């Protein structure tokens, strides 16, 4: 029933004022972040020297305590400054600058949403962040800067009080999501538009947030394929823009009338970095 142009006109007519966004690894592959599950990149080769039975073991606690070096190889690669936000991130930044963003929920741990200038209060880094770390033994918290030197020197960071391994506050499988994730209880009932960008929706409880908006709220998916509860429980006002994520974003930006403003923003922000 609804088209991408229909959704754009809802925004242009100010019929939608409170957009909630969900994003995943697909929005950051254009920045050059190798989606490590695939054997192409050089980060993959740095992990192939290790004990890794499969890619997701890098985010599992039993493997981590057996051998933390693969995870900290990834941590070293995602160090701030190695990668920059791309057009999809700045589309979300411009969405915030134009007063439309209720909240951005992200599964990514590359920190690029904050780098693009989205304020922390508008962001829920649902699978954690490298901005802080916790001793796995004594539970002391540390700023992420405190483990930087070790990580960049390929040393596993240890606690200065108890010598336990100090683990960045990335959410591993089996761990609770951060306290800010609780904002979903009020954000999703309050949204009048849901945007889902670049995620396969294969991890819970993040994926089921798609079902938490009201029945009248359009759900616009910009993604390679139809995934998650949007495939198994489709609703009448769902819109699927299937294809390259950046091309779907570029199409929406043009329909909204934002193209020149978005390019000006990207030019100035990339130069600041």
């Amino acid at each position: 029933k609804l088209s991408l142009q229909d959704v754009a006109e809802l925004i242009r007519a100010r019929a939608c004022q409170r957009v909630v966004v969900m994003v995943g690894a697909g929005i950051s592959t254009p920045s050059g972040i190798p989606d490590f599950r695939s054997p192409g990149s050089g980060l993959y080769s740095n992990l192939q020297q290790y004990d890794l039975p499969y890619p997701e073991a890098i985010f599992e606690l039993p493997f981590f305590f057996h051998n933390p070096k693969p995870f900290f190889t990834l941590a070293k690669e995602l160090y701030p400054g190695n990668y920059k936000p791309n057009v999809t991130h700045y589309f979300l930044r411009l969405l915030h600058d134009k007063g439309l963003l209720l909240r951005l929920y992200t599964q990514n741990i590359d920190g690029l949403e904050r780098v693009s200038g989205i304020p922390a209060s508008k962001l829920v880094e649902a699978h954690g962040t490298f901005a802080s770390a916790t001793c796995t033994v004594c539970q002391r918290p540390f700023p992420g800067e405190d483990i930087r030197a070790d990580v960049m020197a390929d040393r596993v960071p240890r606690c200065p009080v108890c010598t336990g391994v100090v683990k960045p506050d990335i959410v591993f499988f089996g761990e609770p999501l951060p306290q800010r994730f609780l904002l979903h209880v009020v954000d999703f009932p309050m949204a009048d538009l849901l945007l889902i960008l670049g995620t396969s929706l294969e991890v819970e409880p993040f994926a089921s947030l798609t079902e938490a908006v009201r029945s009248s709220v359009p759900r616009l998916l910009i993604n390679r394929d139809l995934v998650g509860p949007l495939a198994w429980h489709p609703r009448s006002r769902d819109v699927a823009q299937l294809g390259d994520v950046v091309h779907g974003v570029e199409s929406l930006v043009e329909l909204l009338g934002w193209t020149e403003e978005m390019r000006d923003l990207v030019q100035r922000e990339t130069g600041k970095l």
């Binding site: 997701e56 089996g174 994926a207």
Partner: peptide, 7 residues
Amino acid sequence: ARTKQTA
């Protein structure tokens, strides 16, 4: 789910 889990 209340913890991060594969769907």
